[PDB]
Write a protein that binds this DNA or RNA. Structure first.
Ligand SMILES: CCCCCCCCO[C@@H]1[C@@H](O)[C@H](O)[C@@H](CO)O[C@H]1O
Ligand SMILES: [Zn+2]
Length: 793
DNA sequence: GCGATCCG
DNA sequence: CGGATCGC
């Protein structure tokens, strides 16, 4: 076999499907059952595959009205997939097919004709087989075993039969054999098709009592294999994915495009029955990225390289001890919502993350490390183990990373799954009432601005606003940052914008975010993804709910405990600064946290040489500002700017600050010193982050990297500390019948039963407070309440 | 000092 | 498509 040729009877499959699924249409009218039916059966054949694919069409009058519309889509689709389209003018589609089949077969190919019209069974041979839509491969064996015939005498058999419209009314019977129970029996000596006179009624009677009719039934052999055509059986070309998506989407069937990819999948590797060997990397494909709201379609597992596919995804999950592989945590969250407790084990995504945090998505790391993130469960599971091997062999030598992996990240994956799976209850009545309120407010703003501008210009349309501003007695980047002057209108628009963004980001999405099966929101939490090592949240991003602002507080208020439960919000007090005191070891900073005093007030004294009890507001504010600034950069230029009044005496403030805290500065120094030498910095626990730009050419960016270099150790250590705390806390939490729900900034929020709350709150405080030993003490401020704002921090 | 998820 | 706010 030089190759496999799949001849598709586009002509008839199109007609068939038009009368199949008859009601199907895109909710807008536009019927689509023919297009659908045709695509669906086409995929099946292509799943089975072939090298060349030729969909033959006819080259109208008393045919269906809407049929041509869908037929054009049929051809368009055929083309979009890279398959060949063939319609010879003045030739019936079946004659062309019979010939393509024969020519290819002669040319040493193996041919499979995707069709349903029984006529083609006459071509049927070794090498030439038929593929019926419904199913079954039709072969010569099939024919002899099911009909008792051979292709060479099937065109004949059917001649004296009829099927549909192959008109032949009147068969009689004879021994109740009719014509069907008969059929084969007249093969022994023709009569109708050459010699034989006297014979039994019907069989011969009806034969002669029906001239003309045979001179029509001849259509059965109307499968001439000798039509001279040129088309070559070349392999199907590259499918126009960009348009194919658009196509399927125009028809509303974009959602099934997933299967269309499943044909360009590289040659399959060895397989085995479902149950996989202990420790096989799993793979999976979901209907949507968000696991809680996802349909698990396809579960697979590779071990050794043999890939195993689960016949039944949703049940196979019970055959696994753990979900081990790319996106484990996500599979577990789903298994959890399926009443199955499937533990997330190893995951290449975690090892990759550790090696270098510029590894966040499974599409990225896979591409980076010699692979690709496909959509097939098998392919994915294979990639998964392959990656694991590779990334482990590296990380393994790394004793700091390896500790981080086994003790923090990997155990953290299981903790996250549960939070995602459990979720939080929202006060949707409060939420809806809130939306109603914020709405009126945005209005007030819109009005105010139109009042100033005069002309009721449609705000929220960059280009019209640009105009309006530039006559009010760009924006992106430039004036967006610079959207102010001695003008109230700019502020009014700025308040309108935030009230809207908060609205269209938290206030509105929230209700839909409530899962029907559980009655609560499931904020997705991600381990990798950030640059410092912090946990990012999505749907919603809790991280971006404004803190301390009335609107922010009003928003949090929506998250509530479960009826007879209370929420316990535990916040780490200045964890970043105590981490600084520790990392730098600046005995003064250390001293303050040790004495248990208001670091700001203290920093003020040592800066303005006055007793703690003498430090005035402006004093402590400068101190607080400097303190916060230390953490990310603040230059000096910013410092003054922020402190507003400081006329470059800001440099004075900084010097005084480092004078009191000399080691803090020595830390900045060393940090950058080693960083720009080693190529990276690290957190207290060895979490590595590369900052190549510390040696950047454009000082503008060399500045930025500087920031990151010391910023990562501090924020980074804080990130690790929390992750580890959650890892220790989780177990004891389940013991107490309590539950972890969120994690935002340096906070953790638990839901616990009524008065269990007090015990739970204390246990949590202790665990967190004593997570990991540090120079300065770790302080956890806890709050217990009914709504998130009740607990507060 | 830039990010993270959503806007529009 | 690409950019911004709250975030730390
Ligand atoms: C413990 C109390 C110590 C004294 C608190 C006030 C210190 C101010 O001391 C001065 C600053 O005024 C000046 O800006 C810089 C320039 O280097 O010199 C500092 O050392
Ligand atoms: Zn046909």
């Amino acid at each position: 076999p030089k190759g496999r040729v799949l001849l598709v009877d586009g002509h008839h499959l199109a007609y068939r499907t038009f009368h199949a699924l008859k009601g199907l249409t895109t909710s807008r009218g536009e019927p689509v059952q023919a297009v659908y039916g045709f695509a669906k059966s086409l995929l099946k054949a292509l799943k089975e595959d072939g090298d060349a694919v030729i969909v033959v069409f006819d080259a109208r009058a008393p045919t269906p009205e809407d049929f041509p519309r869908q037929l054009a889509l049929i051809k368009e689709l055929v083309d979009l997939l890279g398959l060949a389209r063939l319609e010879v003018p003045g030739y019936e589609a079946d004659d062309v097919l019979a010939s393509l089949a024969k020519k290819a077969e002669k040319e040493g190919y193996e041919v499979r004709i995707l069709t349903a019209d029984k006529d083609l069974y006459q071509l049927l041979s070794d090498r030439i087989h038929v593929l019926h839509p419904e199913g079954y491969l039709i072969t010569p064996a099939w024919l002899w075993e099911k009909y008792g015939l051979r292709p060479d005498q099937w065109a004949d058999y059917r001649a004296l039969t009829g099927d549909e419209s192959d008109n032949l009314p009147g068969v009689k019977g004879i021994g109740e054999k009719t014509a069907r129970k008969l059929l084969e029996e007249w093969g022994s000596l023709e009569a109708l098709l050459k010699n034989l006179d006297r014979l039994k009624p019907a069989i011969r009677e009806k034969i002669l009592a029906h001239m003309d009719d045979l001179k029509l039934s001849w259509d059965l052999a109307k499968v001439r294999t000798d039509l001279p055509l040129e088309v070559d059986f070349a392999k199907r070309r590259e499918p126009d994915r960009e348009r194919l998506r658009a196509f399927l989407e125009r028809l509303e069937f974009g959602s099934l495009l997933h299967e269309f990819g499943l044909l360009e999948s590289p040659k399959a590797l060895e397989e085995a029955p479902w149950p996989p060997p202990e420790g096989a990397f799993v793979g999976f494909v979901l209907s949507r990225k968000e696991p809680m709201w996802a349909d698990l379609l396809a579960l697979a597992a590779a071990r050794g390289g043999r890939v195993h596919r689960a016949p039944e995804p949703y049940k196979a999950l019970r055959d696994l001890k753990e979900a081990r592989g790319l996106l484990a945590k996500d599979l577990s969250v789903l298994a959890l919502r399926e009443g199955l407790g499937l533990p997330p084990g190893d995951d290449p995504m975690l090892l990759a993350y550790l090696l270098d945090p510029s590894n966040t998505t499974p599409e990225g790391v896979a591409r980076r490390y010699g692979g690709e993130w496909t959509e097939e469960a098998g392919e994915r599971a294979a990639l998964s183990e392959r990656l694991f091997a590779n990334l482990w062999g590296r990380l393994e030598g790394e004793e700091r990373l390896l500790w981080l992996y086994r003790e923090v990240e990997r155990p953290l994956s299981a903790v996250l799954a549960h939070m995602e799976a459990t979720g939080v209850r929202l006060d949707v009545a409060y939420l809806r009432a809130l939306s109603l309120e914020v709405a009126e407010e945005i209005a007030r703003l819109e009005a105010e601005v139109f009042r100033l501008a005069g002309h009721p210009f449609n705000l929220n349309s960059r280009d019209q606003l640009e105009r309006v501003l530039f006559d009010e007695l760009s924006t992106s980047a430039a004036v967006l940052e610079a959207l102010r002057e001695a003008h109230p209108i700019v502020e009014k628009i700025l308040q309108y914008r935030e009230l809207t963004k908060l609205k269209s980001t938290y206030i509105d999405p929230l209700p839909d975010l409530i899962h029907p099966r559980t009655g609560r929101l499931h904020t997705r939490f991600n381990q990798t993804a950030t640059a410092t090592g912090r946990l990012s949240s999505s749907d919603p991003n809790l991280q971006n709910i404004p803190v301390r602002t009335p609107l922010g507080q009003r928003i949090r208020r929506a998250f509530i405990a479960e009826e007879g439960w209370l929420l316990v919000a535990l916040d780490y007090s200045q964890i970043e600064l105590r981490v600084l005191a520790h990392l730098s070891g600046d005995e003064n900073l250390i001293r303050v946290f040790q004495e248990g005093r208001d670091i700001h007030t203290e920093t003020a004294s040592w800066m303005f040489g006055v007793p703690r009890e003498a430090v005035d507001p402006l004093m402590r504010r400068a101190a607080k500002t400097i303190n916060f600034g230390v953490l990310y950069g603040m230059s000096a230029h910013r410092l003054s700017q922020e402190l507003a009044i400081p006329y470059e005496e800001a440099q004075a403030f900084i010097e005084r600050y480092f004078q009191s805290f000399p080691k803090v500065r020595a830390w900045i120094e060393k940090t950058l010193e080693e960083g720009r030498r080693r190529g990276y910095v690290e957190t207290l626990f060895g979490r590595r982050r590369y900052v190549p730009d510390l040696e950047a050419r454009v000082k503008s960016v060399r500045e930025a990297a500087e920031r990151m270099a010391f910023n990562m150790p501090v924020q980074g250590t804080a990130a690790d500390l929390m992750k580890l705390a959650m890892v220790k806390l989780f177990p004891r939490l389940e013991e107490m019948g309590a539950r972890m729900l969120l994690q935002v900034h340096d906070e953790l929020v638990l839901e616990a039963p009524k008065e269990r709350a007090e015990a739970v709150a204390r246990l949590a405080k202790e665990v967190m407070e004593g997570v990991y030993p540090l120079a300065v003490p770790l302080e956890v401020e806890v709050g217990i309440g009914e709504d998130w704002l009740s607990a507060k921090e």
